[PDB]
Chains A and B, each alone.
With several copies, the nearest count.
Chain A
């Protein structure tokens, strides 16, 4: 989920290495002035790296990470609006999507917001994370 973002449109090209020359493109990049929020879920304690690289230019991200303690999660089931993004390909049985808004993207479109029926984790009073998602679970 994008918390703060900015875009730069910067051109890039292929080089004239030879002394004689006779293509090029514009990249709308997300800029250094930006911060995004994600959540990882695991069965076990995880040594997550404090630096990662993304995208066309192997671009550095600072990851600052906190474990959500059992004093602030709760488990429940019913109907909930997920304010986070979600990938519909990873949606299991025992979750169903009632309503959704999408962001169209290769390799697959995401939901940017959805109403679901199924089990969830109230990790704070204003976000709900779908329980039991795993890579390709619809497929």
Chain B
């Protein structure tokens, strides 16, 4: 229901989670490196009968501490549906190719904004944040997250959207703690997502594929 379906009989469902391509705050030249990979034979060398092993290529990887600004957006959720989607954003930790070996990331939620419709683009938040620093991007991650909260509030005041609630700063690091208290408790979590299940199943039989 929240992330959609489209294969086979019984129709298709639009994702209520709206997402976008995100951009590195820094330039590609400061933000990646190429590493070489080998694959020797288990005898510990790249030849198996004096025949060489053709297994040496190189792959490019994004460096640590590089930041990707984002707005992901949720349309028409229930409160448990919000806790599920927010749960995914805090509980996920791996992203790229080769998840099995690489690509851990740290998602800092910097704001939650309730609105009648979509706020600024992902490129626009990135270009605003780059301008606010003038490109002096070698700043510790806390100073960078505290700056992102302030550029985001500047941009929200230029958007033609009624903003019902703007959870930032001390209200956000209380809300994140109240959500950590759900996701660390089996009784609260089973109750809350069981309720969502009913809501999503109700939706399925009343309006969706059933």
Instruction: Give the chain A neighbours of B15 by CB distance below 8 A.
Output: 58
Q: Which residue of B18, B21, B159, B207 is within 8 Å of A50 (Cβ)? A: B159
Give the interface SS of chain A, mostly helix, strand, loop or mixed.
loop
Instruction: Give the chain A neighbours of B11 by CB distance below 8 A.
Output: 20-22
Q: Is B12 part of the binding interface, using a Cβ–Cβ cutoff of 8 Å?
A: yes
Interface window among B32-40, B57-65, B116-124: B116-124
Q: Is A70 part of the binding interface, using a Cβ–Cβ cutoff of 8 Å?
A: no
Q: Is A25 part of the binding interface, using a Cβ–Cβ cutoff of 8 Å?
A: no
Q: How many angstroms from the CA of A49 to the CA of B162 in the assembled complex? A: 12
Give the size of the chain B interface in residues (CB under 8 angstroms): 24
A20 touches B159 (CB 8 A): no
Assign chain A's interface to a size class.
10 to 19
Given A49-B117, A51-B118: A60 in contact with B16 (beta carbons within 8 A): no
A58 touches B18 (CB 8 A): yes
Q: How many angstroms from the CA of A53 to the CA of B117 in the assembled complex? A: 12
Q: Is A125 part of the binding interface, using a Cβ–Cβ cutoff of 8 Å?
A: no
B208 touches A62 (CB 8 A): no
Docked complex: A1-58 residues within 8 A CB-CB of B: 16, 18-22, 32, 47, 49-51, 53, 58
Q: Which residues of B contact A (CB under 8 A)?
A: 10-16, 18, 20-21, 76, 117-124, 159-160, 207-209
